[PDB]
Paper text:
Instead, the cotranslational insertion of Sec into a nascent selenoprotein is promoted by a specialized elongation factor, eEFSec in eukaryotes and SelB in prokaryotes. eEFSec is a translational GTPase that binds Sec-tRNASec with high affinity and stringent specificity, and plays a pivotal role during decoding by delivering Sec-tRNASec to the site of translation in response to a particular in-frame UGA codon. Human eEFSec adopts a chalice-like structure composed of four domains: the N-terminal D1 (residues 1–215), D2 (residues 224–304), D3 (residues 310–455), and the C-terminal D4 (residues 477–575). The height of the chalice is ∼100 Å, while its width is variable; it is the largest at the cup (60 Å), significantly smaller at the foot (30 Å), and the smallest at the stem (20 Å). The N-terminal D1–3 folds into an EF-Tu-like structure (see below) harbouring the GTPase site and the putative Sec-binding pocket. A detailed comparison with a myriad of translation GTPases acting on the ribosome reveals that human eEFSec is a structural chimera of the general translation elongation (EF-Tu/eEF1A) and initiation (IF2/eIF5B) protein factors.
The isomorphous orthorhombic crystals of eEFSec:GDPNP and eEFSec:GDPCP diffracted X-rays to 3.4 and 2.7 Å, respectively, while the monoclinic crystals of eEFSec:GDP diffracted X-rays to 3.3 Å. The asymmetric unit in each crystal form contained either a head-to-head (eEFSec:GDPCP, eEFSec:GDPNP) or a head-to-tail dimer (eEFSec:GDP). Even more unexpected was the finding that the GTP-to-GDP exchange induces ∼26° swing of the C-terminal domain D4 away from the predicted tRNA-binding site, which results in >15 Å translation of the entire domain. D1 and D2 ratchet slightly in the opposite directions: D1 moves towards the ventral side (that is, the tRNA-binding face) of the molecule, while D2 rotates the other way. The domain movements, which are most noticeable when the molecule is viewed from the side, cause the GTPase site to relax and the Sec-binding pocket to constrict. The binding of GDP to eEFSec causes disorder in switch 1 and slight repositioning of switch 2 further away from the nucleotide, which yields a more open conformation of the GTPase site in the GDP-bound state. In particular, a segment of switch 1 that harbours Thr48 is ordered in the GTP-bound state as it provides the lid over the pocket accommodating the γ-phosphate. By contrast, this segment is disordered in the GDP complex. As a result, Asp92 and His96 point away from the GTPase site and are not properly oriented for Mg2+ coordination and GTP binding, respectively. This explains why Mg2+ is not present in eEFSec:GDP even though the sample contained 5 mM MgCl2 during purification and crystallization trials.
Author numbering: 2 to 33, 52 to 62, 85 to 193, 199 to 231, 239 to 382, 405 to 435, 441 to 494, 498 to 519, ...
């Protein structure tokens, strides 16, 4: 559409930072649910200022929205500094967007004498701070929006000049499945996260359990036949109860799925102090819903330990090595983790999973994509034992006698020995043998060395080694 191009802007900050306050300060001074403003573009143009009541909401609102977040603005109170939340908000941002702008709000609490040179204190700190972040170059704008406080605008048009500058470069695809994030509610006003629309289309409301029809839609001047991704319009629909859903998920019917467990693609956050231990609970926020699952990790094999990153699929045919801790720091190019939730969460496919750090350093740990969402409540009795997690369990024994040239004796294995008979075994010398208390080994081909070496020579290390493959869920196994 030649007129009215839209881009979403994530407004980030602390619970008392002035985020919600800077919107109105921008919208109001536009050219004279969510707020926004307009302006020409020398490639109209409107930018909805994403916001929310608090944090948790503003997070869950930015994760599943990532694919539509075009740029992140960072609000800061030029007195408190860079408060707690103002830090988490800065990484999640790094995950979703690709650029950001940092503004110093409340630029009225500084005395004129010590302000311009106290401003630079943070401008320096922020700059240096961002040096270790993909938002490494983010410009900074000192600005005071409500110069008095609650009851009682500074350099706002300036903040608009910048906002548009980095607001360049967008791309949107309508081919996906429909997804709209409701922020107003019978009418429904939200933002389109995935897919395309058209009058007469069918829409689902998983919160209410039903599919309604799009009687009409209206955004700014009424015309509307179809919307694309990133747009922000309102879907007029059946006079259902506009109360049960004042902010929720709407999409194509049968488009979402309810998941009891999922195979994410894992990736620790650098700034995460600590390890990533299999079986370590977490606070997972998947798409737009935060459910507490558990983890498990696993990795590829050494042969293709550096295979390309397949970030959209899953090559379920090949096997995978079990890992007790995320290998951080030759290494792997990426790894995964069979999440297992407590509550039947329910959300998109390939949705941007994130979740970490439950406890009584930063609180965020990793982030990943959802490459597969198990839907059966019995993912253990159905899909699970079929998986191929290689659990390399080793053993070692010591060789002693030499019955013949095709026989030896061993004694180890901390046993049963009637359930392992036949497994391919290898002596400390290099020859191969087939395990045929006590022991009974065979050998096709003994070697020349061990043949020379009761017994004789004092057995300078007749060592016996074993290596068998243990798929995590099958009953017992082989190797090769
Ligand atoms: N002193 C002062 N306070 C400001 C100024 N601008 C905004 N605020 C404060 O911003 C607070 C609201 O924060 P807000 O971002 O709406 O919180 P949220 O809506 O929970 O994110 C109000 O209580 C104001 O006191 C300002 O210019 N000077």
């Amino acid at each position: 559409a030649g007129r009215r191009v839209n881009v979403n802007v994530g407004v980030l900050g602390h619970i008392d930072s002035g985020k919600t306050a800077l919107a109105r300060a921008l919208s109001t001074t536009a050219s004279t649910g969510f707020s926004c403003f307009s302006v020409p573009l020398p490639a109209l143009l409107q930018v909805t200022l994403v916001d929310c009541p608090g944090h948790a909401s503003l997070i869950r609102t930015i994760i599943g929205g990532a694919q539509i977040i075009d740029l992140m603005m960072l609000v800061i109170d030029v007195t408190k500094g860079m408060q707690t939340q103002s830090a988490e908000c800065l990484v999640i941002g790094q995950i979703a967007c690709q650029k950001l702008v940092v503004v110093l709000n409340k630029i009225d609490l500084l005395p004129e004498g010590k302000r311009q040179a106290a401003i630079d204190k943070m401008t320096k700190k922020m700059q240096k701070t961002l040096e270790n972040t993909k938002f490494r170059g983010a410009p900074i704008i000192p600005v005071a929006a409500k110069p008095g406080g609650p009851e009682a605008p500074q350099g706002i048009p300036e903040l608009i000049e910048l906002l548009t500058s980095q607001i360049s470069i967008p791309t949107r695809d309508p081919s996906g499945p429909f997804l709209m994030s409701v922020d107003h509610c019978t009418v429904m006003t939200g933002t389109i996260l995935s897919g395309s629309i058209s009058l007469g289309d069918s829409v689902e409301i998983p919160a209410l359990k039903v599919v309604k029809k799009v009687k009409s839609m209206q955004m700014f001047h009424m015309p509307i036949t179809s919307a694309m991704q990133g747009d922000r319009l309102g879907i007029c629909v059946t006079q259902f109860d506009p109360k049960l859903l004042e902010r929720g998920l709407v999409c194509a019917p049968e488009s979402l799925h309810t998941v009891h467990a999922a195979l994410i693609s894992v990736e620790k956050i650098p700034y995460f102090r600590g390890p990533l231990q299999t079986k370590a609970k977490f606070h997972i926020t998947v798409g737009h819903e935060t459910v507490m699952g558990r983890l498990m990790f696993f990795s590829p094999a050494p042969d293709n330990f550096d295979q390309e990153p397949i970030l959209d699929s899953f090559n379920f045919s090949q096997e995978y090595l079990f890992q007790e801790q995320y290998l951080s720091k030759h290494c792997p190019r990426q790894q995964w983790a069979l999440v297992e939730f407590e509550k039947p969460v329910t959300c998109p496919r390939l949705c941007l999973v994130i979740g970490s750090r439950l406890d009584a350093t930063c609180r965020l740990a990793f982030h990943g994509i959802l490459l597969h969402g198990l839907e059966d409540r019995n993912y253990a009795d159905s899909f699970l034992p079929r998986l191929k997690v290689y659990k390399l369990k080793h053993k070692h024994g010591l060789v002693e006698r030499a019955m013949d040239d095709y026989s030896v004796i061993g004694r180890s294995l901390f046993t049963n020995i009637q359930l392992f008979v036949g497994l391919k075994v290898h002596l400390s010398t290099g020859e191969l043998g087939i395990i045929d208390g006590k022991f009974k080994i065979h050998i096709p081909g003994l070697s020349p060395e061990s043949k020379k070496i009761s017994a004789e020579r004092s057995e300078p290390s007749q060592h016996v080694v074993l290596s068998l493959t243990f798929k995590r869920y099958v009953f017992d196994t082989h190797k090769r």
